[PDB]
Design a protein around this ligand. Structure first.
Ligand SMILES: *[C@@H]1O[C@H](CO)[C@@H](O[C@@H]2O[C@H](CO)[C@@H](O)[C@H](O)[C@H]2NC(C)=O)[C@H](O)[C@H]1NC(C)=O
Ligand code: NAG
Ligand code: NAG
Length: 416
């Protein structure tokens, strides 16, 4: 039995802990994963607006909401009561008609099967979801079992009591090994001591080549206009080609740059000069975003986009708590009956860390090169649209066939 042939009866969820959610289209798409994707995207824009709302406009942003949602879905396998309910609400899993928390894990089996098991060497996604617990903790057999089968995640025991530092180092090495070395410190200096009990860790790694590359020879220093009025020198890339596009409400330009493989694409949201990216951020709702993607059409245009490298690390407890996820991080309120410790009073999640890495260049989301481009016998319409991103713009990396937002971000300053 594997994640791709799993049936609900293969993902048994011990009762006494089940959440009954309240009551409230495209062909070849699984209604199950389709509902789950809308729920995950609801958490995605919500978490994003909350984050950007507490940040300074001139700072970049990059996270993997899919990763966060998944890690926490896996963790909730051993949750119960209010803790279980809080997870269902904060992560929007309850916005799915009337599903039980136990069904959500079935929808993830379906979702995760396509994301990591259906592929190509080109556009593979690397999943890193792990719950680190001190050696004194024993995970329920059903808990380990299902976390393995559905999330390919291990509930890994580490000697936090007397070997805190060497464990943190082991955690950092495991992640680094999963991110091909790009992410080497998911766990910041001095965040794991002899008092650490449970640490949730998750990231998603993606490296892909543009289906339509830019040529380094056409890249050149150009001025980028930051939210603070000042401007800086950026490595602006350039090319002309056919891209799905659409100018939407109040002059916001939406552009989709696909990666080799077609399944995964980069979507860029760029407001008009007159409008602030901040305003577009407050207005971007799951439905507005979806409507925009539906308006896109192939088109020949000029594209000016800067190269950029974003590396964002997160300590999730603070924001998640401020969003309604309380019990999980509370020693008195936490109800994780999937985790047990010899006469140990209270079992709770000490903290959860997530790091994301985005590097964009002429080749795509991967290692740079010298690939030049030669285009012969081409004569394009003199009145074709131009897309010049020399001002802050949003960024989405999505798995189109699964309506999943893998990553989301903001380039408010690409300069060096
Ligand atoms: C994992 O949880 C199950 C509960 O679903 C524990 O097993 C139960 O144990 C009680 C009393 O010992 C029985 O009344 C139930 O019938 C058992 N359920 C089943 C079907 O196993 C189990 O002990 C837990 N494992 C750990 C490591 O704590
Ligand atoms: C969880 O909720 C159930 C009822 O839904 C209750 O009986 C139980 O005491 C609560 N706490 C735990 C940890 O089971
Ligand atoms: C993790 O490290 C092992 C070395 O034991 C290596 O073989 C494996 O390829 C690494 N995992 C990934 C994501 O490549």
């Amino acid at each position: 039995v594997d994640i791709c042939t799993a049936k609900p009866r293969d993902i048994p969820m011990n009762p006494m802990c089940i959440y009954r959610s309240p009551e409230k289209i495209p062909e070849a798409t699984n209604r199950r994963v389709w509902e789950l994707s809308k729920a995950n995207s609801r958490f995605a824009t919500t978490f994003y607006q909350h984050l950007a709302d507490s940040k300074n406009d001139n700072d970049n942003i990059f996270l993997s909401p899919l990763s966060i949602s998944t890690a926490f879905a896996m963790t909730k396998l051993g949750a119960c009561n209010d803790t279980l309910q809080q997870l269902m609400e904060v992560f929007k899993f309850d916005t799915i008609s009337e599903k039980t928390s136990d069904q959500i894990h079935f929808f993830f089996a379906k979702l995760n099967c396509r994301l990591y098991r259906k592929a190509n060497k080109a556009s593979k996604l690397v999943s890193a979801n792990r719950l680190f617990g001190d050696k004194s903790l024993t995970f329920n057999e059903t808990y380990q079992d299902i976390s393995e089968l559905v999330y390919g995640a291990k509930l890994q025991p580490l000697d936090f009591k007397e070997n805190a530092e060497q464990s943190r180092a082991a955690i950092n090495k495991w992640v680094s090994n999963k991110t091909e070395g790009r992410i080497t410190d998911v766990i910041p200096s001095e965040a794991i001591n002899e008092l650490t009990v449970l640490v949730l860790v998750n990231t998603i790694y993606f490296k892909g080549l543009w289906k339509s590359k830019f040529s380094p020879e056409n890249t050149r220093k150009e001025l980028f206009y930051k939210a603070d009025g000042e401007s800086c020198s950026a490595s602006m890339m350039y090319q002309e080609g056919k891209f799905r596009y659409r100018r939407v409400a109040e002059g916001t330009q939406v552009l989709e740059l696909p990666f080799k493989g077609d399944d995964i694409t980069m979507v860029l949201i760029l407001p008009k000069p007159e409008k602030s990216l901040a305003k577009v951020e407050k207005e971007l709702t799951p439905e507005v975003l979806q409507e925009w993607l539906d308006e896109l059409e192939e088109m020949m245009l000029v594209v000016h986009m800067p190269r950029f490298r974003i590396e964002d690390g997160f300590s999730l407890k603070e924001q998640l708590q401020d969003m309604g996820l309380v019990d999980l991080f509370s020693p008195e309120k936490s109800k994780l009956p999937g985790i047990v410790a010899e006469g140990r009073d209270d079992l709770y999640v000490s903290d959860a860390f997530h790091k994301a890495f985005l590097e964009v260049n002429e080749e795509g989301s991967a290692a740079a090169a010298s690939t030049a481009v030669v285009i012969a016998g081409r004569s394009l319409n003199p009145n074709r649209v131009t897309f010049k991103a020399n001002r802050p713009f949003l960024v989405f990396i999505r798995e189109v066939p699964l309506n999943t937002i893998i990553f989301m971000g903001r380039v408010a300053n690409p300069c060096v």
